[PDB]
Design a protein around this ligand. Structure first.
Ligand SMILES: COc1ccccc1CCNC(=O)CNc1nc(NCc2ccc(-c3ccccn3)cc2)c2ncn(C(C)C)c2n1
Lengths: 326, 248, 826
């Protein structure tokens, strides 16, 4: 049946090339021999035999078979290398996580500079992303690694969230200690910079706001190489962490340790004056220092900017053409 | 989309172990030992009850697709617990599971692990993942016992006695093939039903429909009492054979 | 890691901007000409220009303006670079010693902002109270010109109008006032504001908004006698000033877009206008004086003067002389006469300055069998299209072959003693239903000619409607003699067929040498072409014969001969064709993990693919199997403009951001992943747009030339005419030269006080990294021009390594010899 995974062989796919390098194994593009559908097979190598099957993959196999959404990537099946006949101990063959092949990723479309985003296009990009995030947050899962390279895009304008390797369940009642500093520094929330380890789903929201701004500026908003440096840049725009705006900031481990040069005032509306008013409000709420005062995914979807966006009118972004190469 | 992980009692007459000449009593003895091994090893390591149960469910499912005589029961158990730890985010190092398994097993039993215990276990992880069809997410009677108990209102101390007794019945049912016969939701009801009959409590009154004599229905639709009795019989039989007697 | 060296062989020649004023002395009339990174200062005479000084800047000159604040004797120069380095400069001369003073400087980049579509705009107030900068959508930046602002500190004023087309400061206003054209969904409008340095905000402007032409392009600020502004469009010119409104829409300007303007009479009576077809107009302001004593604008008139080079900047100098600054063609001095000549023209050319123009393609060929190598470049566009033959002999000798149409690709075919050149000319839909060419050009003035009769796409049934006046490109293959450079033959490709690739080679067991052209059927409706042809021509006995044609389902962007086979890139696919004994192309093997395979290069059985966004890929042909195999991909994302193979391990690429990078095989065979990973080991901001990489050298080789430290030779051509050269170095020589750069940068004074390390830092809008693996040879070659005290200061505490001398001190005479050898590679 369709459900018996791990037995079908990777012979069934004609490998086209390598689309990316993996934290545990390299990702190849491929075509299904039977249907012609284009897939993306991730290589999962157990040959290291240090801790066996990677937990990062186990989280992607656990969560993505639960999550069904138009804005969340689909794991179609898991297939294997030709296994050694009747000798599992000698067998060191690897496993592959078959996914849908998304044509482009946000990092490449903006970095080449070839993509031009109108307001309506941004609305459709954000509405899908938030709908996906809301679905995931409602199921009490946290992505924990939102990045521009993790927002895949089909030419149609469909957006899908992608790298669930660092994702884990969130419990509101029991504040169990999780890992720390999970999101990449440029998209990392202020609380994790100060090390809460008991984080809220609002960590993913901060990142998406960073993306919202980056879509308007075409340049990431908070680019720094050091955790304190990031806090300064964030502090300049969003305001310095202080007890009035963040009553519980004093409980965070590094609040006294990590300090901005000054107690900067919030300037977000001024520095983003060119952003439309409907969107600027969304940014102010998404980039709020206090995770308890930071807006939710549902709140972003019930928005003047996003509420009246119709997902039927996808309106594809201005993707590169031959004249655009000229 | 998703696999079927439930069989009929009559089907257990045709497991690989049975057809290789193992009699029904032995396969059920072997299952209790392997499950209790998993339970005892993980408890010594401080593992969450869900992690113990997930390993046990993997274990039970495994020996519905494979034989007991060709695949050792204690290596498999250790492998299941190792994977369960990663699935349920309560991870342990394979060497530590071996250490504890050695502490608890005698010399004959630990002979199954062979010359290199860690290797025999880590190697099996491949077969386990393919066997359980990479369906790693598992739900357990515990969450439903609490979800349903939360909707009961009445004497605080009569409900907490019901829950603990039912909770003990859940831990005991892991030694059996009930995990392979009935969804966890039904198990949770069955153990509430069993504890209710024994504690001479009438759970219908604690519900929001004090007059709905079939209270299980407001939690689990389409569950006949015939199902709940079959489950109770199977749980009570364990107490009858063993020296342990009903807690009450 | 990899080590490489980059030098300029020809400096940028295209004119990016030109201004006049009183910069060197309050007495002289100056002409400042800006070429990319280069500033040229001239003094105007009665015969022409007297050069006085040239400086390089560590940045692309984006803004260049002269102004004279109260208290100064002479004009000061403002320059802003494309990386937002701002500075104010002063000319100072002490007898024979000429130097440039940096009076104020700073970097005006904002942390958060959106770069504007119409680019950086910089303007200065008529009272020289402030500098206005339009850098980001929705923001106006003000640098106030107070004596104390030596760091050029500035503030932003929120601007409601997000999409601004052009802005100028107005004359005759009570407060600093800006007049600008902007675009919103309702069309284009003209609007004014007042700028308050005290309040640091805009106040309501002197006159109301007016709706203007949809393609309103430029804002001319009119001087005090009239006041107000003029707005230039595609069809109309309008004058606005409070209650006054004029509009002239002469049919002559509708024909060609107007791109430049200047003032001929300081009072605003007469302006000069130029268009993209090279025509030069005079815009006349007809005055009417009232009995009140006031002077008003009565009417506007436009008069055609003649033809100049397609000009990026015009500046009127004096008498009848105008300087024409051209980016697409050669720049000029022309004299405007009061009386027309017998052809009706008032414009007569005086001098012609050489502009290599855009170098679309180029090849190196030893025409005279000298062992040297000459560079034949496809240069210019439209009427300025030219072939330029370049040889070394101390200056470069350049010959120009006028084509009057756009050259696209060039390739040399020795067997036929000629070149093949792909070209395109502009025809316009005419009343016959066909098209008519605006002027005769190479493809029309060939000795013999042919037209393609192919029936491949003839089935059509796809409608493409034509409106009278619309432009079309007509692409041709030109056969040009290598000695006379006379057009021997012209082959016109199919209607709406664009020629994209050209090679000359033998294939298989066929002894004939062919011209092979790859084409694509282009229709305005398609985002990406879905039809194409690979055509095999033979040039024989003065005629071009079509040997075979292969149909493809895409655009043949790039082709390259591969060991007797034809390697062609068709859109996403990279394909290898075999040439059969029946003289037809045959598919052998394909590759499909490509977004758009724009560029191809081969060494041995290795192929280098340049993708539009996904950077370089090293494919390999595996003959045992008859197919391709992915050796390694550059996983980092870079948009490509040209690529080249340096050696079996190092690969050179060019970014559309004026950046160069070198990728190498990671050469660690531990994990298969490491080999499949190309690591960018070289990064360098060139500052120019590389269109063509070509192996070869222009230096004369008599076989007596001392072996230089540098190994290899790649020449590259750019859009601004700059020709450069890349070569490799040994690890020791790199460390020596790099250590010397750091010493030179501390010693050499930069114009505008721009840090050299910042200028060459790899810079994309979203990423900025320090340069690596590249020696700025133009910095190294400047060691020879610094004074003796400075030379000795540089060599202090300098040690050699990795040679016979493990630790060896350097003297100023030792390094003079080393650099002098490095100057002999070009
Ligand atoms: C070293 O590091 C990097 C740094 C910068 C850029 C890339 C990487 C590698 C890691 N990136 C990745 O692996 C990219 N993830 C990605 N991209 C997809 N489709 C968009 C896409 C991305 C890249 C290409 C591409 C093709 C040719 C050359 C380059 N890129 C094409 C399509 C995609 N669909 C399904 N899945 C699931 C398996 C998660 C996908 N994962």
């Amino acid at each position: 049946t369709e459900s018996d995974w791990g037995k079908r062989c990777v012979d069934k796919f004609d490998i086209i090339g390598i689309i990316g390098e993996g934290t545990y194994g390299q990702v190849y593009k491929a075509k299904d021999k039977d249907t012609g559908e284009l897939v993306a097979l991730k290589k999962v190598r157990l040959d290291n035999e240090k801790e066996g099957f990677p937990i990062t993959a186990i989280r992607e196999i656990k969560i993505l078979r639960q999550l069904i959404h138009r804005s969340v990537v689909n794991m179609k099946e898991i297939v294997t290398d030709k296994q050694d006949a009747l000798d599992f101990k000698k067998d060191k063959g690897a496993f592959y996580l078959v996914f849908e092949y998304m044509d482009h990723d946000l990092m490449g479309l903006l970095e080449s500079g070839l993509v031009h985003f109108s307001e309506d296009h941004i609305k459709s990009f954000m509405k899908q992303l938030m709908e996906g995030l809301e679905y995931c947050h409602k199921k009490n899962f946290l992505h924990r690694d939102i990045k521009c390279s993790n927002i895949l895009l089909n030419n149609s304008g469909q957006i899908k969230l992608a790298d669930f390797g660092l994702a884990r369940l969130y419990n509101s009642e029991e504040s169990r200690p999780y890992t720390n500093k999970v999101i990449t520094l440029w998209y990392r929330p202020p609380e994790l910079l100060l090390g809460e380890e008991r984080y809220t789903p609002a960590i993913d929201v901060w990142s998406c706001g960073c993306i919202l701004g980056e879509l308007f500026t075409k340049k990431p908003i908070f680019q720094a190489n050091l955790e304190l440096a990031q806090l300064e840049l964030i502090s300049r725009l969003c305001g310095s962490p202080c007890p009035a705006v963040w009553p519980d900031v004093i409980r965070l481990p590094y609040f006294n340790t990590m300090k901005p040069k000054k107690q900067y005032r919030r300037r977000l509306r001024e520095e983003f004056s060119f952003i439309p008013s409907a969107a600027l409000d969304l940014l102010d709420h998404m980039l709020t220092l206090d995770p308890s005062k930071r807006c939710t995914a549902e709140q972003t979807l019930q928005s003047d900017f996003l509420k009246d966006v119709e997902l039927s009118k996808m309106a594809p972004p201005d993707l590169p053409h031959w004249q655009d190469c000229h | 989309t998703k696999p079927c992980w439930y069989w009929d009692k009559k089907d257990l007459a045709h497991t690989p172990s049975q057809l290789e000449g193992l009699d029904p009593a032995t396969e059920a003895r072997y299952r209790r030992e392997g499950a209790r091994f998993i339970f005892d090893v993980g408890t010594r390591l401080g593992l969450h009850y869900d992690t113990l149960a997930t390993g046990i469910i993997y274990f039970h499912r495994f020996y519905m697709f494979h034989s007991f005589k060709q695949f050792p029961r204690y290596v498999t158990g250790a492998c299941c617990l190792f994977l369960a730890g990663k699935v349920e985010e309560t991870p342990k190092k394979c060497k530590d599971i071996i250490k504890t398994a050695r502490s608890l097993l005698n010399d004959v039993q630990f002979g199954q692990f062979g010359d290199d215990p860690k290797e025999e276990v880590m190697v099996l992880e491949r077969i386990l993942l393919q066997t359980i069809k990479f369906d790693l997410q598992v739900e357990h009677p515990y969450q439903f016992l609490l979800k349903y108990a939360k909707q009961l209102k009445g004497d605080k101390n009569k409900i907490q006695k019901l829950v603990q007794m039912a909770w003990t019945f859940v831990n005991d049912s892991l030694c059996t093939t009930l995990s392979l016969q009935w969804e966890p939701e039904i198990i949770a009801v069955a153990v509430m039903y069993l504890a209710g009959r024994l504690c001479k409590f009438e759970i219908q009154e604690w519900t929001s429909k004090p007059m709905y004599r079939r209270w299980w229905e407001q939690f689990v639709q389409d569950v006949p009492v015939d199902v709940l009795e079959d489950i109770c019989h199977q749980i009570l039989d364990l107490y009858s054979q063993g020296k342990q007697q009903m807690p009450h | 890691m990899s080590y490489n060296y980059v030098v300029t062989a020809q400096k940028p020649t295209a004119v990016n901007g030109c201004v006049t004023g009183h910069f060197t002395s309050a007495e002289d009339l100056n002409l400042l000409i800006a070429k990319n990174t280069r500033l040229e200062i001239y003094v105007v005479t009665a015969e022409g220009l007297r050069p006085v000084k040239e400086v390089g800047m560590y940045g692309k000159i984006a803004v260049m303006e002269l102004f004279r604040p109260k208290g100064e004797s002479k004009d000061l120069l403002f320059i802003l670079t494309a990386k937002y380095n701002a500075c104010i400069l002063e000319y100072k001369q002490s007898g024979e010693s000429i130097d440039i003073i940096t009076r104020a400087h700073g970097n005006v980049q904002d942390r958060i902002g959106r770069p504007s579509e119409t680019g950086i705009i910089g303007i200065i107030d008529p009272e020289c109270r402030m500098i206005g900068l339009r850098l980001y959508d929705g923001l106006f930046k003000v640098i106030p010109l107070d004596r104390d602002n030596k760091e050029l500190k500035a503030f932003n004023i929120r601007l409601e109008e997000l999409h601004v087309i052009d802005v100028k400061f107005l004359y005759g206003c009570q407060a600093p006032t800006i007049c600008f054209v902007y675009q919103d969904p309702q069309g284009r409008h003209v609007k004014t504001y007042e700028v308050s340095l005290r309040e640091k905000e805009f106040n309501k402007g002197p006159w109301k908004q007016e709706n203007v032409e949809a393609e309103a392009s430029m804002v001319i600020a009119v001087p005090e006698p009239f006041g107000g502004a003029i707005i230039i469009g595609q069809e109309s010119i309008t004058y606005h000033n409070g209650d006054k409104y004029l509009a002239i829409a002469p049919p002559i300007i509708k024909q060609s877009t107007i791109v430049c303007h200047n003032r001929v009479d300081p009072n605003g009576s007469r302006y000069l206008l130029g268009d993209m077809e090279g025509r030069l107009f005079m815009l006349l302001l007809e005055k009417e004086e009232q009995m009140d004593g006031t002077v008003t604008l009565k009417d506007l008139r436009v008069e055609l003067l003649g033809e100049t080079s397609i000009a990026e900047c015009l500046t009127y100098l004096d008498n009848g002389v105008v300087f024409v600054g051209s980016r697409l063609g050669d720049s000029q001095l022309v004299k405007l006469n009061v009386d027309s000549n017998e052809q009706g023209s008032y414009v007569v050319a005086m001098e012609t300055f050489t502009n290599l123009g855009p170098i679309v393609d180029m090849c190196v060929v030893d025409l005279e069998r000298q062992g040297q190598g000459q560079l034949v470049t496809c240069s210019g566009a439209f009427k300025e299209g030219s072939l330029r033959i370049i040889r070394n002999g101390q200056k470069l000798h350049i010959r120009t072959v006028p084509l009057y149409e756009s050259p696209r690709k060039i390739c040399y075919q020795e067997v036929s003693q000629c070149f093949g050149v792909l070209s395109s000319r502009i025809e316009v839909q005419d009343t016959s239903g066909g098209t008519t060419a605006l002027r005769p050009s190479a493809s029309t003035q060939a000795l013999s000619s042919s037209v393609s009769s192919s029936k491949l796409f003839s089935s059509s049934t796809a409608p493409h409607e034509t409106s009278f006046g619309e432009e079309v490109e007509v692409h041709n293959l030109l056969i040009i003699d290598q000695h006379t450079f006379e057009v021997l033959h012209a082959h016109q490709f199919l209607q709406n067929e664009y020629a994209l690739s050209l090679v000359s080679c033998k294939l298989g067991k066929d002894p004939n040498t062919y011209f092979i052209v790859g084409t694509a059927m282009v229709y305005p409706e398609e985002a990406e072409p879905k039809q194409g042809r690979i055509v095999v021509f033979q040039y024989s006995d003065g005629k071009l014969q079509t040997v075979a044609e292969k149909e493809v389902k895409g655009a043949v962007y790039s082709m390259v001969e591969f060991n007797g086979k034809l390697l062609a890139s068709i859109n996403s696919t990279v394909r290898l064709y075999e040439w059969t004994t029946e003289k037809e192309l045959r598919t052998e093997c394909n590759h499909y993990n490509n977004i758009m395979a724009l560029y191809l290069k081969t060494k041995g059985d290795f192929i280098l693919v340049g993708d539009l966004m996904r950077s370089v890929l090293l494919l390999a042909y595996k003959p045992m199997e008859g197919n391709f195999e992915e050796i390694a991909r550059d996983f980092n994302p870079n948009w490509m403009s040209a690529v080249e193979i340096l050696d079996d391990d190092n690969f050179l690429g060019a970014e559309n951001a004026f950046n160069l990078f070198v990728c190498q095989k990671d050469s660690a065979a531990t994990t298969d992943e490491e080999r499949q990973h190309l690591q960018e080991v070289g990064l360098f901001h060139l500052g120019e747009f590389v269109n063509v990489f070509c192996h070869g050298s222009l230096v004369m080789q008599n076989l007596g030339e001392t072996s230089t430290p540098t190994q290899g030779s790649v020449l590259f051509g750019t859009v601004n005419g700059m020709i450069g050269l890349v070569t490799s170095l040994s690890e020791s020589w790199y460390n020596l030269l790099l250590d010397m750069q750091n010493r030179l940068n501390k010693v050499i004074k930069s114009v505008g006080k721009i840090e050299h390390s910042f200028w060459r830092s790899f810079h994309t809008e979203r990423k900025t990294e320090p340069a690596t693996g590249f020696i700025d040879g133009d910095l190294i070659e400047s060691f020879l021009d610094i004074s003796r005290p400075k030379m000795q200061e540089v060599v202090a505490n300098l040690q050699y390594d990795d040679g016979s001398g493990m630790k060896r001190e350097a003297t100023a005479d030792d390094l003079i010899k080393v650099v002098e050898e490095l100057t002999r590679i070009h």
